[PDB]
Amino acid sequence: ILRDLKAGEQVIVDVLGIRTIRKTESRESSERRVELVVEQVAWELRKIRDAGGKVVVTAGPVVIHTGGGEHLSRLIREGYVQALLGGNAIAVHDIEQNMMGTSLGHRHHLKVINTIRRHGSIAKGVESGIIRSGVMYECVRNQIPFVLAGSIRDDGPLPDTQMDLIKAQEEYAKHLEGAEMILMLSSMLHSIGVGNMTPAGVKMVCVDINPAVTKLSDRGSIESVGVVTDVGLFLSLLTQQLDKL
Amino acid sequence: TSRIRFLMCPPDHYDVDYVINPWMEGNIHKSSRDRAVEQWQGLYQILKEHAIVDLVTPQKGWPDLVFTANAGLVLGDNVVLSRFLHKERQGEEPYFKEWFEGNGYTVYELPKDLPFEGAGDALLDREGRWLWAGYGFRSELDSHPYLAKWLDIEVLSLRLIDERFYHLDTCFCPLANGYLLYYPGAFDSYSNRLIEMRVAPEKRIAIAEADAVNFACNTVNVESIVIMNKASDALKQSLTGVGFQVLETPLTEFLKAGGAAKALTLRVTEPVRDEVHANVYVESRIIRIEGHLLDSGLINRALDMIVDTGGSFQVLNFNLGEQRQSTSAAEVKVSAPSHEVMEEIISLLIDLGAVDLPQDERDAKLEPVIQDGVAPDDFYVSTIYPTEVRINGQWIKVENQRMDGAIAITQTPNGLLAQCKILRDLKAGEQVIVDVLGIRTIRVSSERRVELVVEQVAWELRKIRDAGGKVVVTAGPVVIHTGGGEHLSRLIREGYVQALLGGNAIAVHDIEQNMMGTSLGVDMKRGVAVRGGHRHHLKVINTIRRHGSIAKGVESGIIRSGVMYECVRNQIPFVLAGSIRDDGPLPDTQMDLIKAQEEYAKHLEGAEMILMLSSMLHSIGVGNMTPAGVKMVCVDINPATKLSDRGSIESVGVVTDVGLFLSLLTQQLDKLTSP
Amino acid sequence: VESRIIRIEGHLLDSGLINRALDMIVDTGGSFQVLNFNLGEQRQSTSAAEVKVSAPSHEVMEEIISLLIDLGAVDLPQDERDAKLEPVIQDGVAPDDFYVSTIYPTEVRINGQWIKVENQRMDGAIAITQTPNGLLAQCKILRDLKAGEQVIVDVLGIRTIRKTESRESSERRVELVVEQVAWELRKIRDAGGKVVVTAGPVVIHTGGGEHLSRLIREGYVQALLGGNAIAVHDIEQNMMGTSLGHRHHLKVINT
Amino acid sequence: ILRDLKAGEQVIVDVLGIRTIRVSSERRVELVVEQVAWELRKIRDAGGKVVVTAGPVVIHTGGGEHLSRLIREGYVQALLGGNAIAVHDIEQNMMGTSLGVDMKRGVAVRGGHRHHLKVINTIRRHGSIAKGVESGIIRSGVMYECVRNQIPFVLAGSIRDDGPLPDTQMDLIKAQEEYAKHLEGAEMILMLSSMLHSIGVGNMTPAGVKMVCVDINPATKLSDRGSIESVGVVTDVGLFLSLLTQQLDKLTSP
């Protein structure tokens, strides 16, 4: 794996001189209940921004896999997001989409992870101009803090990813301080995690298509709302509904 | 003094005329009174060969008078008279009272509207040591301390949870020499825990559902004789194996009304010990609650949570507000069968904004921390809501609120600080709130395919086990939630599993199910809970950290069964990978994920097959590390499993419930052991 | 605006009974005022509450009393009245404002007597007959009604006899498809082609209704194939702004 | 279509001369299986009446032998269904296929309509499912058992029916009538994955009748009659039926 390579070793490049040895037959919800919710979330998100509040977002790679990418970029770009919490995959997938227009097809994916490790961090791949757009791009430009927490499933990982889960929890917690809204977009594990840490009196929006996730918004109906459509659609609507000024 | 006497009543006016239990349903006027007579006569006559039998006069218009087991409870010269829940049986009370009075018994009557239905719902230990009392469907929990005082006996309370077993004597039967005949499925986990503390395993005779719906616990025991309706051969061997002689007599016309042998009798000569006196474990506490109770269904929320948790209530007063839009106020006497249950209930009501009577307000209890990152026994588990605790008479706001934590009290220059902390952050010297005093808050695979795959995978597990191969299982907490953990621990125990790869949560919930019978506070004997609490599994996390490892938890005796138990007992290597959502974590969880990946990969070497039991995050991680030519079975209920990408040859996927799969899997591995 | 006082009994606080009653009232368009509350002495004692109900019109009052009847609410001993009866004058059609039966055991008051309804079924009417064997009340489905029969209208003189605890994909793969379908549908219309639509009531239940209307309105649809439900649900949405709540639904079919 | 063929017409046979020009947990399903089994046993002993309404998925999924065993052993007093469930069950027993898919395998690259159209045509030739059993060409299955043990069944027509069978009621006013008549005195209704028919049957049933509703799609949530008299389980219908007969067996042990 990439992180086990030692300076000095020879590594195969290009595609000459390679064959495989397979056997033979080896080889042989509701929707405008959503713009309902959206229209509300949009307005809450408005006034918190104006009032100098603090919004936190958790996000899974599914944001990138649907259209969600550039929409989250705008949000962070236009002052709506004061922190972003995720894992390895959301950062690598965003960077793959912006650096190549693809979203995992493994060559593109691994080439991204290797490049960011070559430069030594995501902020350095931005200072050096290899990253010029996207979710992670905006965070660095606009100095929005992010924490990427490791998982048992991580390729690489990126240098930025916190593979010590104890410190990862403490970094999540610290950045959650004073949060008024937590925006949770298809972030599966990270949503539950953030939930656990967050006290009442904090508005929490939860989006996923699995309406079996929104099930686990076991707080008020006045401090929790859960919708069940894809974040692409959601973040899309949320962006043009926000744009209506 | 050694002569035994029963009260019965002949079925002259017997029939099924109404429906007040599930057995009666569909059975109205389907009773054959001739067959009822000859069946009653059979019992009467077998009973007269071993005892005395007195009779009440039968009374037209009260068919269920034949079930004298519910007339009251007699101990010595005292009888507490039954008070029936349903009015269809309330007209029996005068006729029972009259018989009891005419036979010289001192008759105690319960308050009106407080139900209690007699020896049918309360059963003496046969060596007179105590009284077993049921509640849940008929008798009320708050009748129990009356029994203790009036009959002067220790009273133990058991909660019934199956509506087919609505009287204690339908699923519970103390016997001579201390043997017990019961049906575990009729009780909740706390009640079962209790039975298991009081009656030794060699003296427990837990019966099967086939025997229980023939009313095999509804048994009359004289000395070494047990009389019932129908007994399986398995049951007969069990009983006569320990010295009882079994007598079967058909009682099916009475099963149509929901009773059998023991329901048709009442033993009025019961052993009185001089050393035996009143004793109540039932506790009660009065709370006050205010808001829009009728409006937001808050009062109905709270009462539901009390019953569901195994407690009971009496609303003492309800008062509508001043004007039309005002807040309502209630005062509720809350009752529990034990302190442990009271603490679960009060935790749940604190959360809702209930508060103590001014006269009963108390300081929070404190116990010190003596180990870093370990809380003392019975620490209070915080919630997401704003919280004040009462220290030295003063209510103070808790800081850094957060849900699955403890509350630590310390002295500082500027006064007392009350702080919410997670378990691992607790430091020696700190004082932590325990108990519940002084606390308030301020607020799609077809059937055909699943069977075929179960055939294949079973055949392959058998094959690999015989060959000295290596099977690796990766499983998530849903395996335990869904109810499939005994199936998993059986696989591990019988040698089909060589390594277990998982996370923090599956280990916690499986130890939780085996220590308490709950997974995330939801009792497993029932499929349900009005809510479910975090007290049970946080206590697990804290206990294991106190010991220092799951292995130390097994060596000490506090873990006796389950998945993790079997891994330890049969030296099966397991790896627990950390995640961002982990409570605790357990001492055994690897929170360095570079090390985790390494350990996963090492235990994956030489694997011939991998079982992936509903844990997406871990199944992908494990898949990523495995080369082709390893067989992979992937089970999850969400079709997006479609990440089984390696072809028909070496990766099969099935879309169904994981416990259901595991259930059929062990079943299939059994019928391959027939020859 | 109309007011009534109802009475409710049972285990009101722990069953959620009185909570459900208040919810129905407010959600259906009325308002309530709890006048009094007698608490039972023990948990199994019965409790009673008297509640004033307001509605903005008669139509909404009877909609609300209907839902309350199911939960077992009654008129005061003093306010009991006979059910209003109106005759059937055309086979298979009920008189305006006929009461719509539910699945629960029902009694009606005729000539001061409470009478059990036979052949109880939901979404029917109740017919009253004087027979050689006395008064007969039976549920009938609308199409079984015969000219001459008397049928209960309004909501007076009706109570239920329940026991106690009786009563206690991807998305812009879509605008992908859409954009294609839209264009095909365009040129077929222009070319004088022929488009056929099948449609289930789910079109109406979501927003779909008026959108399908436009399509048919602006020449895009040359035939429509469906069932009973799509037609009744469309007509309910346009005639009342509701979409099945059974009174609205049955009133449409009867009309 | 088959019913439009007139005597005298010549019809192409064989294949010559033809070308074309182109989510309930495990714990809950078991508990409900306990309850429903106990209730079926109870009702059978009492001389009660259990009514089953079932759709073709029962047969597709592979649960028909379980259903025909229930009917054979006396737990079912009436069967209410449609054209399709009758066709596929006779198809499975005559050929081992449901919609051309071999049942010995869980799979088919495609699956053809030849097998069940041959069933529809054969039964119309005899004139009834009953005549199909008397002649020997139907020897097993759901419909077989109904005929052999004289269990009344009603088959309601629908818009999607091929054929139909001679036994299908294509006048739906009559269908509703026949459904309602066979529903009188029912103590329990089993609803085995057939939404259209389960709703129709529900609409006609008064409260106080026990209703078990089994379907794999949670929207079953149309079980509206309360915890007391309507239980719903979300799982595969054949799997349910499999555990159900298994549970009815171990209640026959003593």
Ligand SMILES: NC(=[NH2+])NCCC[C@H](N)C(=O)O
């Ligand atoms: N001890 C008993 N099991 N008694 C059975 C009583 C049966 C009676 N019909 C009832 O519902 O109360």
